[PDB]
Ligand binder design. Structure first.
Ligand SMILES: [Mg+2]
Ligand SMILES: [Mg+2]
Ligand SMILES: [Mg+2]
Ligand SMILES: [Mg+2]
Ligand SMILES: [Mg+2]
Ligand SMILES: [Mg+2]
Ligand SMILES: [Mg+2]
Ligand SMILES: [Mg+2]
Ligand SMILES: [Mg+2]
Ligand SMILES: [Mg+2]
Ligand SMILES: [Mg+2]
Ligand SMILES: [Mg+2]
Ligand SMILES: [Mg+2]
Ligand SMILES: [Mg+2]
Ligand SMILES: [Mg+2]
Ligand SMILES: [Mg+2]
Ligand SMILES: [Mg+2]
Ligand SMILES: [Mg+2]
Ligand SMILES: [Mg+2]
Ligand SMILES: [Zn+2]
Lengths: 25, 63, 127, 97, 214
RNA sequence: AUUAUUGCUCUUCAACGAGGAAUUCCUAGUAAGCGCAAGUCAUCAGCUUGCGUUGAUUACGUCCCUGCCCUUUGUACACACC
RNA sequence: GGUGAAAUUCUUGGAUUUAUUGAAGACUAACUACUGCGAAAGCAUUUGCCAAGGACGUUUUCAUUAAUCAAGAACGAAAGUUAGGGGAUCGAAGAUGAUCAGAUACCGUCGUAGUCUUAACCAUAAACUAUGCCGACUAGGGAUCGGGUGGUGUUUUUUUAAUGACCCACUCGGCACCUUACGAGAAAUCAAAGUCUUUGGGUUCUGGGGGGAGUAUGGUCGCAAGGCUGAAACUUAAAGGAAUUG
């Protein structure tokens, strides 16, 4: 896939991982 | 009806997309010294005689 | 010699406008654009159509009594194409060939100091 | 690899010029890269010259042709206006014709 | 089943004092009726005629003129000066590549008080024998010329209304005066007054308006 | 020899009044009209392969349509756009 | 009206067109160029004010005061965020008309945020010449920008000048192009990417097969979006560059 869509791909992914981890803070 | 007679001076070449049309310069026999280029229909060689149904008009390129 | 008025042909794409008015402009006469004389809706701007419209336009011109006219030719202009439409050339011819009179014509196409971003965005109209 | 020393077109010692909109597709494009053409053509045309002076007043008048600049987007400049395409060394020719 | 043509009144336009001919053209209004007659209704609209049609000479082919109507008497309506323009073809012509364009203007009043803004346009010219292909000015050059033209233009106006001003512009008096002061700076071909417009007119003053009529 | 191989005689006397959109072939002894020999064949040519007879009109051109070649150009294809 | 073609749409509410005149916000057309300037981002209407700069000129002044730079710091397109203003235009979103087998799109209509500005943030772009800075040396050519020098050059006439523009030759410093290549390179090409196995002028920075991955983790900056710093296990024989023929 296009580089810049792959960038936006993992950007989303990092936010959700950031999200989920906060539950356990 | 003002009939006008003109003799073919030269064969310029084929116009028209299909190409069945020829560009030709002519000289009128009545009152010579002026030449107009006309678009023909049939086959044409030099020294033919074209009857121009209208004396002053001309054309150049066809599609 | 004659009686003078203004022609003012607006020739765009997809239609063509020809309407004569009094030299002051406040009082006009006989519009009949090109979309009036045929409906294919794709043919509205055609040179053939503008001719037929220039026919009916020159008609009422004399039937009123303007015997002569000055033309101001016009395109869409503004932020638009700025180039004269197809049916403005036929129109001028067909209103000259009507036996009417012509003199001193110019271009009124609006041309900006440019501003006001053109439509279609940065990547252009793409098809 | 790099296929032009001019890169796209005509910019050295500047780094930013300002964009113009293409007269066809309305695409933005830098002015240095623009591919510009002056359009100079009569208000009248091939056929309408005779029928003009005929029914017109004045002694042959003026005949003041229209002038405007044209800017193309290189997609449109290739699709219609001056493009063709050129061989490796035909590209290097900047001669107008 | 109406046909306003069988209704509408007719008229004929009379030009101001000094150009060539005061006869201009015709117009259509309406019958003059009680409760919205033909008089106070329209009248004072404007007419744009080339002054070469007005003067008759073709060296004047450009330079359009605006004539605003003011008063009317007996199928005769007299007009006055609403402004002056240029033909698009001429300007689009005068502007050529490989050379510098210079414009300037000023807002200025007059005796009989008419406020107006006149413009000016001038292009640099090559000098005979010049080898280099462009001939551009020095931008210090440009500032000075703009100043001088501004200097010159401010003086010519405010002399005697637009009346003498009209008389001033027609045989290009200013155009040369520019050219005279200019030549000490840069060569400069063309140099016309291009546009002049009006914004604030004074009170009607029926008397002074008739000074141009006879 | 019935579902009738072919031939002959009498009788029966259909559609078809020049064929919509489309589309084939062709430049001189050619096109088209016309029959004949040979192949096949015990019998069966409305087919084909050749043959001669009668014998035109119209081009003698172009790139508009269609087909294919050629450069130029781009390519991440080389089992090569299936 | 709009398009390849159409349709949603607008039209007794006189649309589209014309005319006179007014309002609002944005932009700066043509002139505009292998032309200028700035550290870079970037900078094009006028005029006034405010401070700043390179090049040049220089028989002026100080006299090594410098080169380059981890840390640290100023500026930093577009979008985006906070709070006012502004909100003409074009227009992420959304809603529609169409096209399509489908069409969450391309084309058309409406149009929220936005686009502008003030006060604050944010620090990223193919932020590109994909090419560190200072110094030296090595080769030919005609244009052009700025400064300067040379003139019984041309043109401007007034009475010759003085000027101003222009011509020719030189010289500094510019933005670039042309031809060569001694030389260099894997080649494309390159007055540097040259003066490198005949390998050393000074100095800063980065890379060490491909994926995994700019991911995980810690720190830190941020209102947020996110920025900076930044691994491993595991997997894999290629991935990649330039050029040749198909
Ligand atoms: Mg919880
Ligand atoms: Mg396309
Ligand atoms: Mg490539
Ligand atoms: Mg560029
Ligand atoms: Mg940049
Ligand atoms: Mg038949
Ligand atoms: Mg047989
Ligand atoms: Mg068979
Ligand atoms: Mg290749
Ligand atoms: Mg401007
Ligand atoms: Mg808005
Ligand atoms: Mg949507
Ligand atoms: Mg849909
Ligand atoms: Mg969607
Ligand atoms: Mg970066
Ligand atoms: Mg770049
Ligand atoms: Mg050199
Ligand atoms: Mg000197
Ligand atoms: Mg070589
Ligand atoms: Zn385009």
């Amino acid at each position: 896939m296009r580089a810049k869509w792959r960038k936006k791909r993992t950007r989303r992914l990092k936010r959700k991982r950031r999200k989920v981890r906060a539950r356990s803070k | 009806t003002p009939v006008t007679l003109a003799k073919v001076i030269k064969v310029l070449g084929r116009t028209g997309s299909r190409g069945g049309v020829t560009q030709v310069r002519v000289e009128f026999l009545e009152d010579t010294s002026r030449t107009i280029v006309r678009n023909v229909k049939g086959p044409v060689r030099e020294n033919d005689i074209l009857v121009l149904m209208e004396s002053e008009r001309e054309a150049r390129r066809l599609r | 010699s004659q009686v003078f008025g203004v022609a003012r042909i607006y020739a765009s794409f997809n239609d063509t406008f020809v309407h004569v008015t009094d030299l002051s402009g406040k009082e006009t006469i006989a519009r009949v654009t090109g979309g009036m004389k045929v409906k294919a809706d794709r043919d509205e701007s055609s040179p053939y159509a503008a001719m037929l419209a220039a026919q009916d336009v020159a008609a009422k011109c004399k039937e009123v009594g303007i015997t002569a006219v000055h033309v101001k030719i016009r395109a869409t202009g503004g932020t638009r194409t700025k180039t004269p439409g197809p049916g403005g050339q036929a129109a001028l011819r067909a209103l000259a060939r009507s036996g009417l009179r012509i003199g001193r014509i110019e271009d009124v196409t609006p041309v900006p100091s440019d501003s006001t971003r053109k439509k279609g965005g940065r990547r252009g109209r793409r098809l | 690899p790099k296929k032009r020393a001019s890169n796209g077109r005509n910019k050295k010692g500047r780094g930013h010029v300002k964009p113009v909109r293409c007269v066809n597709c309305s695409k933005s494009i830098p002015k240095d890269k623009a591919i510009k053409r002056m359009a100079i053509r009569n208000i009248v045309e091939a056929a309408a010259v005779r029928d003009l002076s005929e029914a017109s007043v004045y002694p042959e008048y003026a005949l003041p042709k229209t002038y405007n600049k044209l800017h193309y987007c290189v997609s449109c400049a290739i699709h219609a206006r001056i493009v063709r395409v050129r061989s490796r060394e035909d590209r290097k020719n900047r001669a107008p014709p | 089943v109406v046909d306003p043509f069988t209704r509408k009144e007719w008229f004929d336009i009379k030009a101001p004092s000094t150009f060539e001919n005061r006869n201009v053209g015709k117009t259509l209004v309406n019958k003059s009726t009680g409760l919205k007659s033909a008089s106070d209704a329209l009248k004072g609209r404007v007419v744009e005629v080339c002054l070469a049609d007005l003067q008759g000479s073709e060296d004047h082919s450009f330079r359009k003129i605006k004539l605003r109507v003011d008063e009317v008497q007996g199928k005769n309506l007299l007009t006055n000066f609403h402004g002056m323009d240029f033909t698009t073809d001429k300007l689009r012509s005068m502007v050529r590549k490989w050379q510098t364009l210079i414009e300037a203007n000023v807002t200025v009043k007059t005796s009989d008080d008419y406020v107006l803004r006149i413009f000016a346009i001038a292009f640099t010219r090559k000098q005979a024998n010049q080898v280099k292909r462009h001939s551009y000015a020095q931008s210090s050059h440009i500032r000075a010329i703009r100043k001088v033209i501004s200097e010159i233009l401010t003086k010519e106006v405010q002399g005697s209304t637009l009346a003498q001003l009209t008389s001033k512009l027609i045989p290009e008096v200013i155009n040369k005066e520019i050219e005279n002061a200019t030549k000490d700076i840069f060569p400069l071909q063309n140099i016309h007054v291009r546009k002049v417009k009006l914004l604030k007119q004074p009170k009607f003053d029926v008397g002074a308006l008739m000074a141009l009529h006879g």
